[PDB]
């Protein structure tokens, strides 16, 4: 669960970061993205200090 979604989100984020000039970037857009950076993002699996943080929307 929540495996394909995180990979897709990381891929989209990397594609947007490495291609700022492009207007619309999607998961199918043939644009450069570093797969090692996506692996590093998934490797942040080890989050130990946040679930939702009560009293704030997202901090």
């Amino acid at each position: 669960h929540n495996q394909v979604s995180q990979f897709k989100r990381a891929v989209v984020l990397n594609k947007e970061k490495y291609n700022p000039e492009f207007k619309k970037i999607t998961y199918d857009s043939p644009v450069y993205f570093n797969i090692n950076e996506v692996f590093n993002y998934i490797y942040n699996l080890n989050e130990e200090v946040i679930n939702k943080i009560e009293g704030e929307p997202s901090l």
């Binding site: 000039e21 492009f22 207007k23 619309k24 857009s29």
Partner: protein, 58 residues
């Protein structure tokens, strides 16, 4: 060529009818590979084409 067998309730007897050619004639704008292969190496500008992949930015 141009002859067709007409069989149906409209005709009294099954018949073989020679069809006149149309005017104008239906023509399909096809591409001839052998004719184009007999010419010299023609360069399909690979930079206008690759700017048409991205209409504005894609």
């Amino acid at each position: 060529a141009g002859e067709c067998l007409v069989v149906g309730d409209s005709t009294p007897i099954p018949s073989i009818v020679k069809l006149e050619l149309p005017n104008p004639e239906p023509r399909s704008q096809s591409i001839k590979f052998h004719k184009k292969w007999s010419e010299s190496w023609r360069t399909p500008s690979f930079e206008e084409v690759i700017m048409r992949w991205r209409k504005e930015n894609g």
